[PDB]
Amino acid sequence: QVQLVQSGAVIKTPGSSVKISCRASGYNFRDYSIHWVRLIPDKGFEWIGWIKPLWGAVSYARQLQGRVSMTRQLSQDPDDPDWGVAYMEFSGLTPADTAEYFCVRRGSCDYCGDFPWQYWGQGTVVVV
Amino acid sequence: EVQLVESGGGLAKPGGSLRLSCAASGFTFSDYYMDWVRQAPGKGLEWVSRISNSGITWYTDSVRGRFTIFRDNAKNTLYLQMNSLRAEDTAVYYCTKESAAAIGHYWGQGVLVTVSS
Amino acid sequence: AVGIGAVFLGFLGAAGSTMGAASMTLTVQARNLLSGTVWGIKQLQARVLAVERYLRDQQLLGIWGCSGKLICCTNVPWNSSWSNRNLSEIWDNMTWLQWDKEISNYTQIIYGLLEESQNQQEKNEQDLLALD
Amino acid sequence: AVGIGAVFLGFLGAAGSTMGAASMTLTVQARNLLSGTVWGIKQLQARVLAVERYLRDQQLLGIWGCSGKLICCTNVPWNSSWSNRNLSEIWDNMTWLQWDKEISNYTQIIYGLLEESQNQQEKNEQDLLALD
Amino acid sequence: DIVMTQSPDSLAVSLGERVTLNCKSSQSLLASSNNKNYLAWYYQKPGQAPKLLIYWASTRESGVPNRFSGSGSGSDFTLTISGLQAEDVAVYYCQQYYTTPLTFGGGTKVEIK
Amino acid sequence: DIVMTQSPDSLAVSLGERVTLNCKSSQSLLASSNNKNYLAWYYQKPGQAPKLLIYWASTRESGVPNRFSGSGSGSDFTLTISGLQAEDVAVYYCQQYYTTPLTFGGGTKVEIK
Amino acid sequence: AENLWVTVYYGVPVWKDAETTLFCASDAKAYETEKHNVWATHACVPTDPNPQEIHLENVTEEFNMWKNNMVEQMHTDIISLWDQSLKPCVKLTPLCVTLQCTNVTNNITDDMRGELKNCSFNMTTELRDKKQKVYSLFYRLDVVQINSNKEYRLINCNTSACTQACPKVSFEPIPIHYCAPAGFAILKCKDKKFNGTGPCPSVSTVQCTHGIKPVVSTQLLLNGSLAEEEVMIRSENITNNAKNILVQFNTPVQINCTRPNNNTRKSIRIGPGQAFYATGDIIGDIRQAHCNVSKATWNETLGKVVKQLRKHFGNNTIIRFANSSGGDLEVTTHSFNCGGEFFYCNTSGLFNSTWISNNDSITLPCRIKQIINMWQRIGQCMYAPPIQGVIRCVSNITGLILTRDGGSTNSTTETFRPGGGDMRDNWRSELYKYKVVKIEPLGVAPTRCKRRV
Amino acid sequence: EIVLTQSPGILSLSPGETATLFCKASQGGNAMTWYQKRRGQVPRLLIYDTSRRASGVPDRFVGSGSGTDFFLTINKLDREDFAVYYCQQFEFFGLGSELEVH
Ligand SMILES: *[C@@H]1O[C@H](CO)[C@@H](O[C@@H]2O[C@H](CO)[C@@H](O[C@@H]3O[C@H](CO[C@H]4O[C@H](CO)[C@@H](O)[C@H](O)[C@@H]4O)[C@@H](O)[C@H](O[C@H]4O[C@H](CO)[C@@H](O)[C@H](O)[C@@H]4O)[C@@H]3O)[C@H](O)[C@H]2NC(C)=O)[C@H](O)[C@H]1NC(C)=O
Ligand SMILES: *[C@@H]1O[C@H](CO)[C@@H](O[C@@H]2O[C@H](CO)[C@@H](O[C@@H]3O[C@H](CO)[C@@H](O)[C@H](O[C@H]4O[C@H](CO)[C@@H](O)[C@H](O)[C@@H]4O)[C@@H]3O)[C@H](O)[C@H]2NC(C)=O)[C@H](O)[C@H]1NC(C)=O
Ligand SMILES: *[C@@H]1O[C@H](CO)[C@@H](O[C@@H]2O[C@H](CO)[C@@H](O[C@@H]3O[C@H](CO)[C@@H](O)[C@H](O[C@H]4O[C@H](CO)[C@@H](O)[C@H](O)[C@@H]4O)[C@@H]3O)[C@H](O)[C@H]2NC(C)=O)[C@H](O)[C@H]1NC(C)=O
Ligand SMILES: *[C@@H]1O[C@H](CO)[C@@H](O[C@@H]2O[C@H](CO)[C@@H](O[C@@H]3O[C@H](CO)[C@@H](O)[C@H](O)[C@@H]3O)[C@H](O)[C@H]2NC(C)=O)[C@H](O)[C@H]1NC(C)=O
Ligand SMILES: *[C@@H]1O[C@H](CO)[C@@H](O[C@@H]2O[C@H](CO)[C@@H](O)[C@H](O)[C@H]2NC(C)=O)[C@H](O)[C@H]1NC(C)=O
Ligand SMILES: *[C@@H]1O[C@H](CO)[C@@H](O[C@@H]2O[C@H](CO)[C@@H](O)[C@H](O)[C@H]2NC(C)=O)[C@H](O)[C@H]1NC(C)=O
Ligand SMILES: *[C@@H]1O[C@H](CO)[C@@H](O[C@@H]2O[C@H](CO)[C@@H](O)[C@H](O)[C@H]2NC(C)=O)[C@H](O)[C@H]1NC(C)=O
Ligand SMILES: *[C@@H]1O[C@H](CO)[C@@H](O[C@@H]2O[C@H](CO)[C@@H](O)[C@H](O)[C@H]2NC(C)=O)[C@H](O)[C@H]1NC(C)=O
Ligand SMILES: *[C@@H]1O[C@H](CO)[C@@H](O[C@@H]2O[C@H](CO)[C@@H](O)[C@H](O)[C@H]2NC(C)=O)[C@H](O)[C@H]1NC(C)=O
Ligand SMILES: *[C@@H]1O[C@H](CO)[C@@H](O[C@@H]2O[C@H](CO)[C@@H](O)[C@H](O)[C@H]2NC(C)=O)[C@H](O)[C@H]1NC(C)=O
Ligand SMILES: *[C@@H]1O[C@H](CO)[C@@H](O[C@@H]2O[C@H](CO)[C@@H](O)[C@H](O)[C@H]2NC(C)=O)[C@H](O)[C@H]1NC(C)=O
Ligand SMILES: *[C@@H]1O[C@H](CO)[C@@H](O)[C@H](O)[C@H]1NC(C)=O
Ligand SMILES: *[C@@H]1O[C@H](CO)[C@@H](O)[C@H](O)[C@H]1NC(C)=O
Ligand SMILES: *[C@@H]1O[C@H](CO)[C@@H](O)[C@H](O)[C@H]1NC(C)=O
Ligand SMILES: *[C@@H]1O[C@H](CO)[C@@H](O)[C@H](O)[C@H]1NC(C)=O
Ligand SMILES: *[C@@H]1O[C@H](CO)[C@@H](O)[C@H](O)[C@H]1NC(C)=O
């Protein structure tokens, strides 16, 4: 199986810097890009940004630059290389950032692009 | 004994058209590939086109389907029609006969084409 | 339909010429089809793939009428449900790259008929020798 | 001796049928005879053994009269000291698995006669062209 | 495409002694099938239609005397004269006829010094 | 030998709408030489001799209208109806004719619910 | 006569698209060198430079560099061939040891940091009884402090024994020609305005590829293939922001890069036939490695690439260039190998631009690493030995690998970051022309002749 | 930016019927993606590449259309198939097409 398992929900203060991890397991984590996408009530889906975890090459949404920061932690052992941990530090928390955050991955088909997101994390509810 | 004597025009406005012909005496058109080679004044000779014994045409990659070549085997002549002329087409043109060892075995006299108004 | 000309006339040179004109140069593509610490395995399997493909094509020829003719005729007639077009508009109009697509669906229907006609002609020849 | 039937008629299907009936399906065994970090060496030597065996058999054919006929006749007569049995009791009675054992001893006596007759026919053909 | 580059631009010598000229190719013109090579060495006079001198990269044309020699195979080619005449001092050319487009050399204008 | 297993045992539907049926094979019936596949889909009425519906695993028989479709290659095969009629509601069969012994399917008895 | 008779022809020129394994080849001068002073000199066949090609008239094939094969093959083969030049080399098993590191002898400035640590350690001698004390010089990026006393270790002491790059073999690029076997052909697109997608009207068959020097550079691909007359930007799909844009421009940008520090290679005997080449003295000044581009020609080429980028984004678009958003070391700062030495040079002076729709030289600083983790393997690092003397090299910036940011919420501008990412974007900029096809004889056609029995 | 607009929005249909959901792209020439989000659950890829079905989705979700007109057709509405539907083009989204039960 392919699992994207996040941390639990959190309540933060206005002005904090929240950090949400995402453990990916069941596949070669160095291959597939990890996207971060959010859901706001009465605003819909908004895309936050992707990371290529082979070198951590990040790219952000334009209206979220200066606030988001994505890192990763690979698996360095010849025995269990099939896992990894993505991170997202979203900083400058406002009460307009109360939303449910998602780490997602594309499908592994030959016509699946970057954005056709098959696999989906359970989401972290963040109330500021 | 084999002469390739040419005819056509020399005076053309830039952006125009002309047809240049070549009669030949000394051999048979049934089995010989023909050519068209031009020389700019003061510059090097350069190839323009080639036609087979039955009408398979080969062009250089600048004339790009603007020039056509037609070899009238009945009226025993070789034809080069030039539509949509360019200023860099001012040259002297030559029809040749190809041997099996080297092309341009025999050589036409030339037509001085000046594309100028 | 061959004339005097000094240019090289090389491999896949007449791929875009009409198929009545690429047929006059078929020994060129027939010639340039066979000869051309760990990497010797890759080179070696490429070479045996080349000779295996050549043997498969020569075997498909050999169980038909022509074994070394390189142009051969046979006794099955052209079913006009296959291509439904004139004889004048193939040898002077289209290429082999374009004729390949137009009968790729009707391919492998034709090859069984070729083997069937060759087996029937072999048994007819054997019976004609046998009655003498 | 071929009729209408829809079954696959595959490789070694008529091995137990009589040899007058397995002769109507010989292109099947001719077709299915060639195409089919360390193990690539084993696969590769198996493939070159396959193509070497195919080339040896095609060379044995080629130095005789037939090079791509797959049924060919020749000019050496059947010596009746070899099998001493009737023509009616081979093509309707026995199989190739059973006929293989009965002339395996007289094999390689026959092949030299085949090469001898083919070389004599080649030199007779060369002399007949030469006198013209 | 195939670039044909003649190494000198001119050669002004005296008459009677030999010279030599070279034409380099950007691509090996040696046909592996025929084992024969593809240069046309041409000779153009001032105001005249050119004529062949060397075909098959080595062989002289009929009507051309023994004083010329096309030489060399592979990619770099040499036209060697043995004795200069007054009829010879005009432009030489090297031509590949291996592919389309047929490209010529630059043209080494040999005159008398 | 070759086991031919039909996946449903019965199918009682209404009339007018489409259905679909499947037959799995224990062995891949796709002939690699002919590149064509070996299923006979048959139709037996109550008390009647059966008739062919689909030959070469895809092609309908003459006398059979356009409302049938034999589909699929390899090892698993699908007979898809487009419109059910009252003349159609009886037993279907799948048959391999790739080898001896010729084995049939179980027989999916389609009737009207 | 209206009944036609079928005829099968052998030797028919017609191809299908196919996936095969091309084989390597080198030039005859590249075949002249020996003893594996470079990689695999006798493993590949020798061939000519600029191999023979013939032009095909009246033909049109559709190409796609993005779904192309043989960039996968070249990527796999260069990774495996990189690995196969390390099995005779020396593993640094006895060097994973406690390093007592002090500062280099230098005028220390407390605001800045020394980028060199003078580290002494016990080294095993060639005798298994006696050990010695020996010192060396390392960089900050290669050692980490383990927890008064100040003892360090290497960063790769908990993942792998680090294979030393052998100083006999060099890492200079030599051009590979990818030659097709029998039955296959290679088609090259001679079209000028061809973006690597769709129909090419002017192809030519060729037996081997042209020369591909293997350069390893994340941003600013060096010594590449120049475009013909104008800058050409190439992408799989422009509106997708997770696709890189490969920018190939006409005239190359001359870049100079140097380490001005004069080093002393010192040999240390590990065991029998085991030598570790360490840094000895820094002879002279302690200066920082850097690079120079020309200010004027870089502004010129940025004007050219903005002129070409406004064709896909409308005329009234403000194009601005900012530096990389983050990542590891060799995805944010542009990496290369200047003769057995791995530089990591800062590109913040280059991509600092804005562009409205109306004698100097940029110095850019570099870091140097000695141990590397090329292609991000699980357990394979690589020590690289120091080399003597001041090291300078000249190169041509041929293109760029850009990436558009995720422009949303009424983006009046569109900004472009540099980014290396995968190495295959470096390899797709050279095999964008070629494809490999399978030549299939035995065509079949009707003509008006029955075989005479 | 690609402005996506979903035309039906709130649509109430009885079970066993068919639903047609329209998505409208401000810029054409690209593909369209269809997601389903049920109440209090994780969204699921239904359709990618405008016609292709994902892994583990039934056949009655039929994507169609091109240019600026993109259709998601559901046939024989199951009780579970009454949720919110989203159309994605590259990084942009629609505001949701809620499918309610009459
Ligand atoms: C982009 O392309 C350019 C153009 O080729 C490359 O520049 C060359 O890079 C190589 C390797 O980095 C250079 O080779 C080295 O040059 C050093 C300088 O010596 C030069 O000058 C002397 C005297 O004129 C010559 O004898 C010598 O051959 C060089 O031309 C040498 O010190 C090096 O030699 C040492 O190492 C080799 C390794 O095997 C030994 O064989 C030698 O004996 C010696 O120990 C080496 O030769 C080359 O000089 C550069 N050329 C130019 C014109 O600058 C760029 O490197 C390339 N960019 C990238 C990123 O690869
Ligand atoms: C790639 O190169 C760029 C520039 O070539 C480099 O950016 C610089 O980084 C440093 C720190 O990494 C930035 O911060 C400076 O650090 C000193 C340290 O004491 C501060 O004192 C500086 O503050 C001065 O400037 C302020 C504004 O003018 C004043 O208010 C203050 O009183 C001080 O005078 C300063 O913050 C530095 O600013 C940037 N340069 C620029 C132009 O922004 C970058 O770090 C390199 N990349 C990497 C990965 O290192
Ligand atoms: C970004 O741009 C690239 C470059 O164009 C683009 O890639 C193309 O994607 C399509 C699919 O979206 C690929 O498939 C082709 O689609 C066309 C038009 O539909 C047809 O020729 C073929 O599709 C037919 O068959 C499909 C299944 O059989 C049907 O579902 C379909 O309706 C058609 O009937 C063909 O498969 C195409 O090959 C690529 N081309 C290239 C050069 O990559 C990509 O899709 C773009 N990104 C997005 C998100 O749209
Ligand atoms: C792209 O350019 C920007 C602008 O220069 C760079 O941002 C700068 O990054 C440096 C770090 O490299 C920041 O330096 C700071 O130094 C203090 C010293 O104690 C340290 O404590 C901080 O944690 C930080 O490292 C600097 O403030 C920052 N400047 C701005 C305006 O953001 C950026 O790093 C460049 N990106 C790349 C990949 O080079
Ligand atoms: C690195 O440190 C070593 C000590 O471990 C230094 O070597 C000593 O330098 C002093 C000063 O000249 C000499 O008196 C000693 O004899 C040296 N000892 C040895 C064993 O060589 C060395 O100079 C330092 N180098 C740098 C560049 O800082
Ligand atoms: C030797 O290196 C150490 C670091 O391991 C230096 O200690 C700190 O260095 C930084 C920057 O170099 C300064 O900002 C700190 O103030 C230093 N710490 C202290 C307590 O001073 C140290 O300065 C270096 N030099 C010497 C002579 O020990
Ligand atoms: C090299 O080895 C020597 C001896 O094994 C180490 O010196 C010892 O260091 C410890 C810790 O300071 C002392 O308790 C011992 O008394 C020392 N022994 C001797 C013989 O001096 C030394 O630390 C090692 N490393 C270096 C860099 O010299
Ligand atoms: C690369 O050039 C090709 C043309 O050769 C472009 O492909 C066509 O683009 C138009 C829209 O501009 C479409 O209507 C056609 O269907 C496309 N044809 C094919 C075969 O894809 C392509 O858009 C260009 N790509 C880039 C990145 O500029
Ligand atoms: C780097 O340092 C070495 C010293 O090891 C310099 O080599 C010396 O150069 C001088 C004259 O330049 C000679 O007289 C010495 O005999 C050389 N010594 C050795 C050991 O080679 C070298 O010149 C320096 N390099 C640079 C670029 O300054
Ligand atoms: C990069 O280095 C080259 C040398 O390799 C520089 O070219 C020299 O420039 C000077 C003038 O500054 C001339 O006098 C030399 O004749 C040039 N030499 C060569 C070989 O070209 C070049 O200027 C440097 N560029 C930058 C931006 O530093
Ligand atoms: C960078 O590109 C330039 C061309 O812009 C190269 O310069 C040419 O080099 C060849 C041989 O290497 C010479 O025959 C040409 O005369 C040179 N032309 C010019 C204009 O200089 C240069 O070699 C490339 N490499 C480097 C390291 O500068
Ligand atoms: C072969 O089948 C395809 C797909 O059904 C069809 O489009 C094509 O027209 C057929 N070939 C011919 C020559 O009709
Ligand atoms: C061949 O030799 C064996 C052994 O001597 C003998 O038994 C057999 O009968 C011989 N074959 C025939 C056909 O007689
Ligand atoms: C190795 O040590 C470094 C420094 O403490 C640490 O960052 C890294 O995660 C460690 N790796 C493993 C595999 O333990
Ligand atoms: C932008 O202006 C140029 C004039 O140089 C024109 O050729 C081009 O079509 C224009 N593009 C748009 C999108 O208006
Ligand atoms: C950007 O450019 C300005 C002016 O050209 C310069 O002062 C500044 O240092 C540059 N930014 C960086 C990060 O180098």
DSSP string, D12-60: TTTSSS-TTTSTT--HHHHHTTT----HHHHHHHHHHHHHHHHHHHHHH
In the structure encoding, which two tokens stand for residue F31, read together? 């002939």
Instruction: Check pocket membership of G323 for ligand 4, CB cut-off 6 A.
Output: yes
Q: Please check whether residue H80 touches G, CB under 8 A.
A: no
In the structure encoding, which two tokens stand for residue E89, read together? 């001092």
CA of G369 to the centre of ligand 1 (A): 21
Q: Is G226:G251 a contact under the CB 8 Å cutoff?
A: yes
- Pick the residue whose CA is nearest to atom 14 on ligand 8: H29
**Which atom in ligand 14 lies closest to the alpha carbon of residue G157?**
1
Three-state SS at A63: helix
User: Which ligand places an atom closest to the C-alpha of C108?
Assistant: 12
In a 10 Å sphere around its CB, with 0-12 CB exposed, 13-18 middle and 19+ buried, how is residue C77 labelled? middle
**Nearest by CB to E50, which of B45, B46, B61?**
B45
Instruction: Check pocket membership of G104 for ligand 5, CB cut-off 6 A.
Output: yes
Q: How far apart are CA B61 and CA B42, in angstroms?
A: 22
Give the helix/strand (H/E) hosting E25.
strand E20-25
Beta bridge partners of G7: C73, G445
Which sign does the torsion angle of CA H56, H61, H63, H69 carry? negative
Instruction: Tell me which residue of E48, E26, E28 sits closest to E105, measured CA to CA.
Output: E26
Measured distance between the N- and C-terminal CA atoms of chain E, rounded to whole angstroms: 36
Q: How far apart are CA C32 and CA C47, in angstroms?
A: 14
Cα distances from A20 to residues A46, A100, A118, in angstroms, run 17, 11, 21
Q: How far apart are CA H59 and CA C8, in angstroms?
A: 58
- Pick the residue whose CA is nearest to atom 44 on ligand 2: G348
Q: Please check whether residue H22 touches A, CB under 8 A.
A: no
Task: Using CB atoms, list chains with 3+ pairs below 8 Å to chain E.
Answer: B, C, G
Find the residue in G nearest to E3 (Cα). G50
Q: How far apart are CA E69 and CA E81, in angstroms?
A: 6
Rounded to the nearest 5 degrees, what angle is found at the Cα of G244, between the Cα atoms of G242 and G245?
A: 135
DSSP codes of every residue in chain B: --EEEEE--SEE-TT-EEEEEEEEESS-TTSB-EEEEEE-TTS-EEEEEEE-SSS-EEE-TTTTTSEEEEEETTTTEEEEEEES--GGG-EEEEEEE--SSSS-SEE---EEEEE--
Instruction: Tell me which residue of G266, G199, G91, G186 sits closest to G439, measured CA to CA.
Output: G186
Going by their DSSP bridges, the two strands E20-25 and G391-404 should be labelled as unpaired
Q: Please check whether residue B65 touches G, CB under 8 A.
A: no
Give the helix/strand (H/E) hosting G75.
helix G71-84
Going by their DSSP bridges, the two strands G318-321 and G334-337 should be labelled as unpaired
In the structure encoding, which two tokens stand for residue G277, read together? 């080449």
Q: At what angle do helices D39-62 and C39-62 cross, to 10 degrees?
A: 30
DSSP codes of every residue in F61-84: PTTS-TTEEEE--TTEEEEEESS-
CA of B65 to the centre of ligand 15 (A): 28
Residue with tokens 């019936």: F29
Q: How far apart are CA A77 and CA A75, in angstroms?
A: 6
DSSP codes of every residue in C14-78: TSSS-TTTSTT--HHHHHTTT----HHHHHHHHHHHHHHHHHHHHHHHHTSS-SS-SEEEEEEE-
Which residues does E76 contact at the CB level (< 8 Å), separation at least 6?
E22, E23, E24, E25
Rounded to the nearest 5 degrees, what angle is found at the Cα of G175, between the Cα atoms of G171 and G179?
A: 130
What does residue F84 show for φ and ψ, rounded to 5 degrees? Answer: -80, 140
The residue type found at H19 is A
Rounded to the nearest 5 degrees, what angle is found at the Cα of A92, between the Cα atoms of G411 and H95?
A: 50
Which residues does G264 contact at the CB level (< 8 Å), separation at least 6?
G279, G280, G281, G282, G283, G388
CB pairs under 8 A between C and D: 52
In the structure encoding, which two tokens stand for residue C105, read together? 């669906």
CA of G140 to the centre of ligand 5 (A): 19
**Which atom in ligand 11 lies closest to the alpha carbon of residue G254?**
28
In a 10 Å sphere around its CB, with 0-12 CB exposed, 13-18 middle and 19+ buried, how is residue B65 labelled? exposed
Contact B30 C17 (CB under 8 A): no
Cα distances from G352 to residues D40, G298, G301, G355, G420, in angstroms, run 54, 12, 14, 10, 18
Q: Is G146:G152 a contact under the CB 8 Å cutoff?
A: yes
Ligand 13 proximal residues by C-beta, below 6 Å: D 102, 105
Cα radius of gyration (chain E) = 14
- Pick the residue whose CA is nearest to atom 8 on ligand 12: C105
Which residues does A78 contact at the CB level (< 8 Å), separation at least 6?
G378, G379
Task: Using CB atoms, list chains with 3+ pairs below 8 Å to chain C.
Answer: B, D, E, F, G
In the structure encoding, which two tokens stand for residue E101, read together? 């487009």
- Taking any CB pair shorter than 8 Å as contact, residues of chain D touching chain F are 6-8, 10, 31-32
Q: Which resolution, in Å, applies to this structure?
A: 3.2
Contact C2 B53 (CB under 8 A): yes
User: Which ligand places an atom closest to the C-alpha of G396?
Assistant: 11
The residue type found at B77 is T
| Cβ-Cβ contacts under 8 Å, D57 against chain C | none
In the structure encoding, which two tokens stand for residue H19, read together? 């639903």
Which sign does the torsion angle of CA C71, C76, C77, C83 carry? negative
What is the layout of strands, in order, in the sheet containing G163-164?
A: G163-164, G382-383, G371-372
In the structure encoding, which two tokens stand for residue G219, read together? 């941003």
Distance of CA G236 to the CA centre of its chain: 20
Where exactly are the structural domains of chain C? 9-132
The per-residue b/e assignment along G234-252, b for 16 or more CB within 10 angstroms, e otherwise, is bbbbebebbbbbbbbbeeb
In the structure encoding, which two tokens stand for residue H25, read together? 């792209």
CA of G368 to the centre of ligand 4 (A): 19
Q: Please check whether residue H26 touches G, CB under 8 A.
A: no
Distance of CA G122 to the CA centre of its chain: 37
Contact H43 A111 (CB under 8 A): no
Q: Please check whether residue G50 touches E, CB under 8 A.
A: yes
Instruction: Check pocket membership of G299 for ligand 16, CB cut-off 6 A.
Output: no
**Which atom in ligand 8 lies closest to the alpha carbon of residue G237?**
27
The residue type found at A88 is M
User: Which ligand places an atom closest to the C-alpha of D102?
Assistant: 13
Three-state SS at D87: coil
Q: How far apart are CA G201 and CA G216, in angstroms?
A: 32
In the structure encoding, which two tokens stand for residue F67, read together? 């409302």
Contact B61 G202 (CB under 8 A): yes
The per-residue b/e assignment along G415-443, b for 16 or more CB within 10 angstroms, e otherwise, is bbbbbbbbbebbbbbbbbbbbbbbbbbbb
Q: Is A95:A128 a contact under the CB 8 Å cutoff?
A: yes
